[PDB]
Amino acid sequence: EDDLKTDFYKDLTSLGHNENQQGSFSSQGGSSFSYSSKRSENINH
């Protein structure tokens, strides 16, 4: 008798994630008054 039973199992299960975000916000308020006055504003978020 010469039984030779053999088995091989291989699993490769790879997962990958890609995530990239940019946000830009800007506000530039202002006001003018003729007495005289001036206002200026800037925002860069």
Curated annotation (Swiss-Prot):
All cysteine residues are assumed to be cross-linked to one another. Individual modules containing an even number of conserved cysteine residues are supposed to have disulfide linkages only within the same module. It is found in: Secreted; Target cell membrane. It comes from the Eukaryota. The chain crosses the membrane at residues 32-40. Component of the membrane attack complex (MAC), a multiprotein complex activated by the complement cascade, which inserts into a target cell membrane and forms a pore, leading to target cell membrane rupture and cell lysis. The MAC is initiated by proteolytic cleavage of C5 into complement C5b in response to the classical, alternative, lectin and GZMK complement pathways. The complement pathways consist in a cascade of proteins that leads to phagocytosis and breakdown of pathogens and signaling that strengthens the adaptive immune system. Belongs to the complement C6/C7/C8/C9 family. It is linked to Complement component 6 deficiency: A rare defect of the complement classical pathway associated with susceptibility to severe recurrent infections, predominantly by Neisseria gonorrhoeae or Neisseria meningitidis. Component of the membrane attack complex (MAC), composed of complement C5b, C6, C7, C8A, C8B, C8G and multiple copies of the pore-forming subunit C9. This is Complement component C6. It comes from Homo sapiens (Human).
